């Protein structure tokens, strides 16, 4: 009985993902986020080990929600006649990376390094768990402003990770790779790496590098803010036009720009408090 266990608060947001509310679990006052998704708007379905028809999003969240992480944790879910309701952990205080960048503009490289590193660790965790997010971008990253810890949120466009080609995509187009634009084909890891290149550029420049399809497939990167050569190099590497010319996660994290990352707590003390 959903209505009983949780006390619902203000609507946090709504859009392609559904409607998400602030809430608190009655039993122990735990902060929570309560996400409603209408059934008729769910295209991708899956099955629990148990073998129950649920949204893929729930399957993926269960796969990654084991242990601690830079990934939002699913605490519970409920089915209703016309919708599924998901109960997720809610950090407090929090701000999404899109709003944070709106407010503060292009981020100092030290801060972008710390943030980008944590995104990489979260994405690796998803991939280790057999999950491909497919919509990595600033709007899908929450900052725990007190702990300086980032977390990945909306798995609504995700899929099981596989080594064969994907021919479907319903993530964010301006973060989608040229091979998707030209051929409607991509492989998971290398498409993720492209979206990570877009994200890093977004962090250090305060906006995404490409708006239009033709810019995406041309793949020419213009830097509108002062950005160090090492950071430009990593970004251009992530945005290589040929999928196989993109770095692996290991190569990103071994990149010279990625060395000597701040810890999350230092990150909050220096840049968020
Ligand atoms: C996994 O799917 C989602 C999603 O699609 C949107 C979300 O939004 C929030 C949130 C919290 C505070 C804000 O100020 C704004 C958003 C928390 C979530 O946990 C959350 C979520 O798990």
**Do 104 and 228 share a structural domain?**
yes
**Do 265 and 154 share a structural domain?**
yes
> Which residue has its alpha carbon closest to ligand 1 atom 18?
33
User: Hunting for tokens 């998901």 — which residue is that?
Assistant: 86
Distance 121 CA to ligand 1 centre (A): 19
Q: Which of 198, 201, 204 has its CA nearest to residue 108?
A: 204
Structure tokens at 188: 């998971």
Q: How many residues does the chain have?
A: 273
The domain tally of the chain equals 2
Distance 254 CA to ligand 1 centre (A): 31
Q: Which of 103, 83, 81 has its CA nearest to residue 21?
A: 83
Q: Say if ligand 1 is within 6 A of residue 36 CB.
A: no
CA 175/CA 5 separation, integer angstroms: 38
Which of the listed residues 73, 85, 88, 138 should we mutate to test ligand 1's pocket, taking the one with most ligand atoms within 8 A of CB?
A: 88
- Looking at 75, 92, 109, the residue that finishes a domain is 92
**Do 97 and 195 share a structural domain?**
yes
CA 42/CA 55 separation, integer angstroms: 7
Which strands, in side-by-side order, build the sheet including 6-15? 6-15, 18-25, 30-38, 83-89, 74-79
C-alpha separations of 187 from 158, 166, 191 in Å: 13, 6, 6
CA angle, residues 137, 195, 120, in degrees to nearest 5: 80
User: Hunting for tokens 């893929």 — which residue is that?
Assistant: 56
CA 233/CA 89 separation, integer angstroms: 36
CA angle, residues 164, 185, 127, in degrees to nearest 5: 50
- Domain holding 9, by residue range, is 1-92
**Do 133 and 64 share a structural domain?**
no
Q: Are 163 and 184 contacting, i.e. CB atoms less than 8 angstroms apart?
A: no
Q: Which residues contact 89 (CB under 8 A, 6 or more apart)?
A: 30, 31, 32, 33, 72, 73, 75
Q: Which of 262, 208, 267, 260 has its CA nearest to residue 235?
A: 208
**Do 68 and 110 share a structural domain?**
no
CA 193/CA 246 separation, integer angstroms: 7
H, E, C per residue of the chain: CHHHHEEEEEEEEEECCEEEEEEEECCCCEEEEEEEEEHHHCCCEEECCCCCEEEHHHHHHHHHCCCCCCECCEEEEEECCCEEEEEEECCCCEEEHHHHHHHHCCCCHHHHHHHHHHHHHHHHHHHHCCEECCCCCHHHEEEECCCCEEEECCHHHCEECCCCCECCCCCCHHHCCHHHHHHCCECHHHHHHHHHHHHHHHHHHCCCCCCCHHHHHHCCCCCCCCCCHHHHHHHHHHCCCCHHHCCCHHHHHHCHHHCCCCCHHHHHHHHHC
To the question of whether residue 142 is assigned a binding role by annotation, the answer is no
Q: Say if ligand 1 is within 6 A of residue 13 CB.
A: yes
**Do 143 and 36 share a structural domain?**
no
Structure tokens at 58: 């729930």
> Which residue has its alpha carbon closest to ligand 1 atom 9?
33
Distance 144 CA to ligand 1 centre (A): 12
State this model's resolution in angstroms.
Answer: 2.0
- Looking at 58, 92, 126, the residue that finishes a domain is 92
Q: Are 195 and 136 contacting, i.e. CB atoms less than 8 angstroms apart?
A: yes
Give CA torsion, residues 176, 153, 133, 214, to 10 deg.
0
**Do 108 and 83 share a structural domain?**
no
Distance 219 CA to ligand 1 centre (A): 31
**Do 104 and 32 share a structural domain?**
no
In this structure, what CATH number is given to the domain that contains residue 12? Answer: 3.30.200.20
> 10 Å Cβ neighbour count for 137?
20
- Looking at 57, 76, 92, the residue that finishes a domain is 92
**Do 266 and 146 share a structural domain?**
yes
Q: Which of 231, 224, 229, 219 has its CA nearest to residue 117?
A: 231
**Do 135 and 66 share a structural domain?**
no
Q: Are 271 and 111 contacting, i.e. CB atoms less than 8 angstroms apart?
A: yes
**Do 224 and 129 share a structural domain?**
yes
In this structure, what CATH number is given to the domain that contains residue 128? Answer: 1.10.510.10
**Do 152 and 51 share a structural domain?**
no
Q: Which residues of 61-93 are buried (b: 16+ CB within 10 A; e: fewer)?
A: bbbbbeeebbbbbbbebbeeeebbbbbbebbee
Q: Which residues are catalytic?
A: 135
Which of the listed residues 23, 33, 55 should we mutate to test ligand 1's pocket, taking the one with most ligand atoms within 8 A of CB?
A: 33
> Which residue has its alpha carbon closest to ligand 1 atom 2?
154
> Experimental method used, please?
X-ray
């Amino acid at each position: 009985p959903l209505e009983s266990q949780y006390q619902v608060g203000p609507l946090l947001g709504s859009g392609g993902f559904g409607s998400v509310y602030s809430g608190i679990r009655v039993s122990d006052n735990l902060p929570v986020a309560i996400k409603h998704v209408e059934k008729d708007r769910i295209s991708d379905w899956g099955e629990l080990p148990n073998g129950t028809r649920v949204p893929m999003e729930v399957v993926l969240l269960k796969k990654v929600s084991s242990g601690f992480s830079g990934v939002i944790r699913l605490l519970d879910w409920f089915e209703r006649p016309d919708s599924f309701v998901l109960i997720l952990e809610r950090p407090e205080p929090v701000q999404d990376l899109f709003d944070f960048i709106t407010e503060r503009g292009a981020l100092q490289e030290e801060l972008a390094r710390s943030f980008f590193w944590q995104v990489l660790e979260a994405v690796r965790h998803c991939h280790n768990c057999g999950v491909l997010h497919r919509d990595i971008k600033d709007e899908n990253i929450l900052i725990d402003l007190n702990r300086g810890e980032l977390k990945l949120i909306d798995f609504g466009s995700g899929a099981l990770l596989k080594d064969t080609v994907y021919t479907d995509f319903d993530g964010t187009r301006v973060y989608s790779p040229p091979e998707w634009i030209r051929y409607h084909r991509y492989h998971g890891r290398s498409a993720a790496v492209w979206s990570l290149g877009i994200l890093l550029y977004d962090m250090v420049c305060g906006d995404i590098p490409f708006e239009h399809d033709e810019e995406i497939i041309r793949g020419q990167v213009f830097f509108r803010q002062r950005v160090s050569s090492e950071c430009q190099h990593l970004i251009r590497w992530c945005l290589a036009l040929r999928p196989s010319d993109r770095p692996t996660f290991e190569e990103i994290q071994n990149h010279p720009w990625m060395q000597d990352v701040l810890l999350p707590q230092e990150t909050a003390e220096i840049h968020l408090h």
